[model samples]
Target chain A: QAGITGTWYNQLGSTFIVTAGADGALTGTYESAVGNAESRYVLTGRYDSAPATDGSGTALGWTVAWKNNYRNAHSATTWSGQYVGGAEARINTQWLLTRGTTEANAWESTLVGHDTFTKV
Target chain B: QAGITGTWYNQLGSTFIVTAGADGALTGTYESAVGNAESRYVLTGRYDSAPATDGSGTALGWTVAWKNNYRNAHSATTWSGQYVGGAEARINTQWLLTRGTTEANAWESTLVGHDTFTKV
Candidate 1:
């Protein structure tokens, strides 16, 4: 119903620290899995939680424009969580990542993946 | 941040009923504007409040598919609230009406307008 908050884990072997937010302004920690090592970077993006109260019932939109990604990474990722749920509150999200792009019409480099996150 | 609810009055002198919602499941009453007269219809669409919580900050995306238009109204409207405010919680929205379309890209028959709504 709103932007995601607190520590969340992903299938990418990554851990995210989504700080409690105010308004559209959001900044969170994105711990990357480079060499299976932790490289923490601040991720900034917008969250649209309009109409949702206390984060429940409605669908939510989330975006994170990674500030530092595997070196000169201009790439970004976007996700939509339709099934927002529990203590294990499964956030079944579909995501599209435009991985490190500089070329045009190169749909080949684009990745479409689905991931589930559970707040720890 | 979410769907528009309550008695929202528009510049066209119409009122809406957005029965506070759950997820993308949104349905509300959309009155007609043929003669600026009131002919009620149900408006439905999805909301992207993914990251936004409690309907504050960030931008909001909203869409409304008109189940009934002037008569056989296939026209729909969408809005992105970059400026959402209060009493006069002004939803200064820009809209596009396909105005009963059958032709392909008859851009002229299409109408573009903006309206400001306040939740009464």
Candidate 2:
């Protein structure tokens, strides 16, 4: 009962997954819309926190580390994406803030999204 | 291209997930027919061995050591089944050779069903 189960959505669609941790936090991997894209997320939201507000707000958010293994044919390069430097909780889910040319370079495109969680 | 993947079916239609191994040999776990039933299997079949015969043949049979997490309602005993003293390969797949009363005592029922594998 004390686990995280929900769907992650994008402009494309949504995926359902579950995560559990002995401690309050939760962490797990998620599949990308594309066939082979993949990402791991470390969520640090409090179980009892209020539902994230629609307006600009910052609460505990997940640090998303993702890699686009599938590259453009001509470019033949992998794209990387991440969250803003510190953390942002304006949206409520992970996103494709920016698709950088390389892994480290993509860190510059970090943008905060929305985050919410329910207590056990 | 390098990982192994397959599905195991039970008489009652059950399955266990298959993953990959770094070495050439393949190792995996199998699910019991009943829910919550668990077992581990180490398959040592040659990827290119001839198809296993149904009556009785022993090429590279896996060692089947199983624990029956589910028990009859009247009897509250956990049945444990293991391969016979040495090994048997009469059949062509893992099977319920025996249902022991207890983990250690149940090693009595050791019957070989069958064994076969295909090469990469």
Candidate 3:
């Protein structure tokens, strides 16, 4: 099993509390720098195996989606990373965000980030 | 101004080659673990100010969009973060991914990742 169930945190002050379902799906909450539980965003995604690798190691892939209620925004991200020795997993992620109440008026942007998650 | 132009790399082996345009727009390419120039995904998005902050610091927001030509998939992401001190910036990102060649057949997933980028 991929065993990707747990909470993850990054230096940027975002917290990802997640759970890997038996059906191979992921569900959780994503809290931004605000650090408030009341403003947490709903999270969803899944785990997959990487299509290609550089022989340095095996790669595991993850995809996550969420909506920021505080900013009225929507976003999606792709995570490409691998398990290092034991309980620690590191991922390099790319994502897109659409801001606005509706798609027609929403402006889009792209960004890249990284995080390490420990099993809890 | 929020100078977020340049290249960023996460430990997972993904590279974000980005440029911040004059009009608050961002463009770049996201390379997955394949690490091949031939497999780089085209990227686009914008920059904005965060709506809320915890008083710990000021927040700068960004949104990004990209399509994985290698996987024949599409994705969008949102970044909520800040400029720490100098040229170094940190971001907490949330994103969604749709896997497939067409919208009708695509499966959606969500993910979260983080990274720090240095201006170059």
Candidate 4:
């Protein structure tokens, strides 16, 4: 019954307080350290709670629909990650952000980023 | 040019021999350790080779469209990762696999997995 329910912080000065649902659903609030630190964003996604057969860790994916309150324009960001356990428990993630709407401007619209989150 | 072009090995015994394109396109072949060792899967994706401003690593994502040549049924697997440097260079990743096609059967179709690939 290990769940990702808790407060998570990342290296980019962002914070996520997420709640896990029984049916592979995740809901949370993401606060960015940049721009308006006071603003909150909606976060949602799905997760696979089963323990990794290889004894590595559990896996999960989430997304944050950013509100353009920040200096830059961001549509949404999706993250796929693994929860590594032990004394130094951490959630390592890689994210894709979409900023452009058309294929012609796809290069400038798509962005790749990564983050490692840990318990508070 | 720190590209992801090389033969990469994972803990699960899978292998990826990929070539990096100038415009973030990645083309490669993947060999599974569990299934027919001789069979190959198509691997392709986009990457952001820009060095991490935080000095962490470059981020990339790729997908392998399985042919279902193995005993199990698999549609495709997408991995988002970061290329870590040092004496032991490695690619840390998180993957999501789709098996089922309907929302009613999604629980069985959606899978979460993780893998770390290292240079050969």
The most accurate candidate by TM-score is: 4
TM-score (chain B only), all candidates: 0.64, 0.35, 0.56, 0.84
Q: Cα lDDT for residue B43, model 4?
A: 62
Q: What is candidate 2's CAPRI-style docking category based on DockQ?
A: incorrect
lDDT of 3 by residue, B10-86 (tens): 55556777675553344566665532234665454444333223222222333333324345233334444433333
The CAPRI quality class of candidate 4 comes to: incorrect
Error of 3 at B93 (Å): 16
True contacts kept of each: 0.00, 0.00, 0.02, 0.01
In candidate 1 chain A, what residue range of length 10 has the lowest lDDT sum? A98-107
Q: Is candidate 2 or candidate 4 better by DockQ?
A: 4
Worst 10 residues of 3 chain B by lDDT: B98-107
lDDT of 2 at B88: 23
Better candidate by TM-score, 2 or 3: 3
C-alpha RMSD in Å of predicted model 2 compared with the true structure? 20.7
Q: Which candidate is the best by DockQ?
A: 3
For model 2, what TM-score does chain A reach? 0.36
DockQ of 4: 0.04
- Cα deviation of B91 in candidate 3 (Å)? 25
Order the candidates by lDDT, highest first: 4, 1, 3, 2
List residue ranges in candidate 4 displaced over 4 A.
Answer: A1-120, B1-3, B35-38, B68-74
